[PDB]
Write a protein that binds this ligand. Structure first.
Ligand SMILES: [Ca+2]
Lengths: 6, 119
């Protein structure tokens, strides 16, 4: 999910 | 952490690209407000709320906290070596991944306009 990795 | 959650999703929903869950409805993904659009979005709303609660623990950063878990033979198990933050975040991620497996997927709800539809 979310791909707000960094 | 996010990478681990992605792996839970790959493990519980192997028929679909994990990316399918990365931008869906008002809550699966970047978004975290509004009326959830359907069952899958409700899985993501509960997950979002779960993270917000876990964040109240000092030093607990749900996107970044590396926890201890296994996914084998169809079953997620948050392990006993987890501290309170790890256990909470792992459990959020666990029941979300399980929720996704039982949720219908509506192609219309992929990549929706959060600003317009999630107030
Ligand atoms: Ca979210």
């Amino acid at each position: 999910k979310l791909v707000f990795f960094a | 952490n996010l990478y681990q959650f992605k792996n839970m999703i790959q493990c519980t929903v192997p028929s679909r690209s994990w990316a399918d869950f990365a931008d869906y409805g008002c809550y699966c993904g970047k978004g975290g407000s509004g009326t959830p659009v359907d069952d899958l979005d409700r899985c993501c709303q509960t997950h979002d709320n779960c993270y917000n609660e876990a964040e109240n623990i000092s030093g607990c950063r749900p996107y970044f906290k590396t926890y201890s878990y296994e996914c084998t033979q169809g079953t997620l198990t948050c392990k006993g070596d987890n501290n309170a933050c790890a256990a909470s975040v792992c459990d959020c991620d666990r029941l979300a991944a399980i929720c996704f497996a039982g949720a219908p997927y509506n192609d219309a709800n992929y990549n929706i306009d959060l600003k317009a539809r999630c107030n």
